[PDB]
Amino acid sequence: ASKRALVILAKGAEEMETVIPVDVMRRAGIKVTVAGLAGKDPVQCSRDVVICPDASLEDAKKEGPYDVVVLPGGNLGAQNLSESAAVKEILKEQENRKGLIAAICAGPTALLAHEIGFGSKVTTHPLAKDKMMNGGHYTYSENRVEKDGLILTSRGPGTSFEFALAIVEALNGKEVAAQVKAPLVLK
Amino acid sequence: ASKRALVILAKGAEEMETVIPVDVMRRAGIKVTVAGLAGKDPVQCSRDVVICPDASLEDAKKEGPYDVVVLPGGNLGAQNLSESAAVKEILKEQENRKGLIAAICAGPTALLAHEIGFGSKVTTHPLAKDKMMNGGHYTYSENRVEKDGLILTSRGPGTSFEFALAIVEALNGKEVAAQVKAPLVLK
Numbered sequence A, B: 001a002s003k004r005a006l007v008i009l010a011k012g013a014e015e016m017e018t019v020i021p022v023d024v025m026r027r028a029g030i031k032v033t034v035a036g037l038a039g040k041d042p043v044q045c046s047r048d049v050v051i052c053p054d055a056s057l058e059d060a061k062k063e064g065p066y067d068v069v070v071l072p073g074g075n076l077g078a079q080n081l082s083e084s085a086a087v088k089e090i091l092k093e094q095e096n097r098k099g100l101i102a103a104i105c106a107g108p109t110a111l112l113a114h115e116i117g118f119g120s121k122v123t124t125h126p127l128a129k130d131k132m133m134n135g136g137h138y139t140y141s142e143n144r145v146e147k148d149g150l151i152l153t154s155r156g157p158g159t160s161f162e163f164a165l166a167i168v169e170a171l172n173g174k175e176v177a178a179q180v181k182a183p184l185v186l187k
């Protein structure tokens, strides 16, 4: 049976950090739902790329559970994720059921906002470190991708492929991740 | 004055190869127009990401000239670009006026279709080599990004950042490309 991914898409999300994981996960045969935080309407990303989500979050959250919940970054996208009661509930459920949570760039700061995964080793974008580390609830890493059990984090646009492939490996295994990786022409 | 980029977005385009250059060029202060080949309506990309273009190609081509014309890849996107009389005319004009043309992955095969840049050294995705090389009108390269004067090509999703930064360097210079690059957390 195919694994399922929920990608939560908010206004101001970093479009690269959204699209790269969606695409790579779909290459890995994962059923990806791109869910609009605000509703069903198109989402204006940080660099003005406009993406039409597959469903509202309100609807998509009724079709869980998901094998991974993915939080893109983008400063303003992450803030929107951080403020969302709906996101809080989704991440708490995902944590409670021992499901994977993956967050990139400023995305992990939503984990702090919703008190998720405290005690984990995590990375973020360098500019989001101080926000993430407020209170000392995580241990900081400078690895490009950091996986501490069911909390998987990464640093920025330029780590998006490694982040996505890490999600693929966690869900579908090392062999599928390698197979998906080879046609991408990664260095 | 700000440089201008036309990114031609067809059904079946590779969404990563579309979004990465758009975003990175906008970081570099380039005015990017994402133009829908088929018209103004949202475009279903190769991995089902749906992007709302800024304008139809029909409209955007009236607001030229552009400092670069960018052709994303994706097998079916590139075929759509290759079949387009409108694209043919845009690329011929761009070539005639000595403007940059940038194409990635299967995207360069549209150059062959429209008889653009013959004699250039070019790269493509490995799987698109034989198509591109039909007739021997180009010289093939395995470099991740190949720039032969005003013809700039690259290989795949995983070379999209290097491709985008090469476009930035060609338009706005090495210093701006370096400045844009550093926050991306590229390896």
Ligand SMILES: [Cl-]
Pocket: A014, A046, A074, A075, A076
């Ligand atoms: Cl941002």
Ligand SMILES: [Cl-]
Pocket: B014, B046, B074, B075, B076
């Ligand atoms: Cl493709």
Ligand SMILES: [Zn+2]
Pocket: A014, A017, A073, A074, A075, A104, A105, A106, A125, A156, A157
């Ligand atoms: Zn980011």
Ligand SMILES: [Zn+2]
Pocket: B014, B017, B073, B074, B075, B104, B105, B106, B125, B156, B157
């Ligand atoms: Zn491609």
